C-alpha cells in the first residue's frame, strides 16, 4: 500500500496527476478528521499522505524537466532556469579557447624555440 | 488602535502565537536544558515598541 518512487517513474503524466488528486483529497479528509477529534491512527496518516504528495510532485517535476532538457538539447539560447548555474564570476569567464588565444608571433616563437629537454652531465 | 495596517496585525498575531508556555513533554527529552519560556511577554510589562 506504500508508494514506491521507482514504480511512480513508470507511470504516465495523467496517472500521476490522478494519483496526486486522490492523495490531496485523502489529505483534506485527514485534516477534517484531525479538526473533528480524530483518532491517533488517522492522525499518523497525515505525514504519510504528505510524503506521498511530495513524492508524486517530485516525480512529475523531474519528468517534465528531463523532457524540457531533451527538447532543448543541441540548441543555443536555452531558458535561464535550464542553463548551468555555477557562479556569476565563473559564468562571466572567458572560454578555454579564448584564454589560449595569442598573436602569430607568439605561436611562431613557441613552434620554433620551445623549452628543450636537456641534462647537465657530459 | 482599531485602525491598523495588515502588516502590523500579522506581526501582532505572530507575537500572540509566540506568547505561550513550553510543552510539558519538552522537559522529558533526553539531555534537556529548557526549563520554561524565557521570552514570555505581558502587554503591561514590556511594550512591543512597533
Amino acid at each position: 500500500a506504500r508508494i514506491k518512487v521507482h514504480e511512480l517513474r513508470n507511470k504516465t503524466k495523467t496517472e500521476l496527476l490522478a494519483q496526486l488528486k486522490d492523495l490531496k483529497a485523502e489529505l483534506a479528509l485527514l485534516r477534517v478528521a484531525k479538526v473533528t477529534g480524530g483518532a491517533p491512527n488517522k492522525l499518523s496518516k497525515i505525514k504519510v499522505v504528505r510524503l506521498s504528495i511530495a513524492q508524486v510532485l517530485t516525480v512529475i517535476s523531474q519528468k517534465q524537466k528531463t523532457a524540457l532538457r531533451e527538447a532543448y538539447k543541441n540548441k543555443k539560447y536555452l531558458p535561464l532556469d535550464l542553463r548551468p548555474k555555477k557562479t556569476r564570476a565563473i559564468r562571466k569567464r572567458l572560454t578555454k579557447h579564448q584564454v589560449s588565444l595569442k598573436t602569430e608571433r607568439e605561436k611562431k616563437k613557441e613552434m620554433y624555440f620551445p623549452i628543450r629537454k636537456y641534462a647537465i652531465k657530459v | 488602535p482599531s485602525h491598523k495596517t495588515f502588516m502590523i496585525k500579522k506581526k501582532l498575531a505572530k507575537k500572540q502565537r509566540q506568547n505561550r508556555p513550553i510543552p510539558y513533554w519538552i522537559r522529558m527529552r533526553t539531555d534537556n536544558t529548557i526549563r520554561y519560556n524565557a521570552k514570555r511577554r505581558h502587554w503591561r510589562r514590556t511594550k512591543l515598541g512597533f
Binding site: 490531496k24 483529497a25 489529505l27 483534506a28 479528509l29 485534516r31 477534517v32 478528521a33 484531525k34 479538526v35 473533528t36 517534465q64 524537466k65 524540457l68 532543448y72 539560447y77 536555452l78 531558458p79 535561464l80 532556469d81 535550464l82 | 495588515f6 496585525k9 500579522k10 501582532l12 498575531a13 505572530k14 500572540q16 502565537r17
Partner: protein, 117 residues
C-alpha cells in the same frame, strides 16, 4: 513640408512586439492556490455549528491569499454546492476565516454531514 504648429512634436514611429528567441522560463509554474490549498478545513466551534444550524452557512479556514471569488469557486469544485454570498475576515491569529452561506437549494446540515463534521 508645411508646418502649422510652432511647437515640435516627436513623430510617431513603429514599435514591435517582443518575439523572444527563447522563453526565459522553461515551463509555466504550478497552480499553488488550487481548491485543496484554498480550503484548509471547516471550523467546528460552537459558533460555527450554530451558524450551520441556523443561517445555512458553513465556516471554513482559508488561505490568507484567497479572495471571495476563489473561495466560491473552490467550494463549488470541492462540494458541488452553490453559494449565496461569502464573508471573510482575518482572525487575530493571522489566519483567514470565511462564512460561506449556501443557496436555499442546498441544505447546510446535509453538506456538513457529508463532509464529516
Amino acid at each position: 513640408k508645411i508646418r502649422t504648429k510652432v511647437t515640435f512634436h516627436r513623430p510617431k514611429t513603429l514599435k514591435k512586439d517582443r518575439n523572444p528567441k527563447y522563453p526565459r522560463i522553461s515551463a509555466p509554474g504550478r497552480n499553488k492556490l488550487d481548491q485543496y490549498g484554498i480550503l484548509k478545513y471547516p471550523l467546528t466551534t460552537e459558533s460555527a455549528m450554530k451558524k450551520i444550524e441556523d443561517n445555512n452557512t458553513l465556516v471554513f479556514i482559508v488561505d490568507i491569499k484567497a479572495d471571495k471569488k476563489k473561495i466560491k469557486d473552490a467550494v463549488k469544485k470541492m462540494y458541488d454546492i452553490q453559494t449565496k454570498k461569502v464573508n471573510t475576515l482575518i482572525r487575530p491569529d493571522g489566519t483567514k476565516k470565511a462564512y460561506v452561506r449556501l443557496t436555499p437549494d442546498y441544505d447546510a446540515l446535509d453538506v456538513a454531514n457529508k463532509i464529516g463534521i
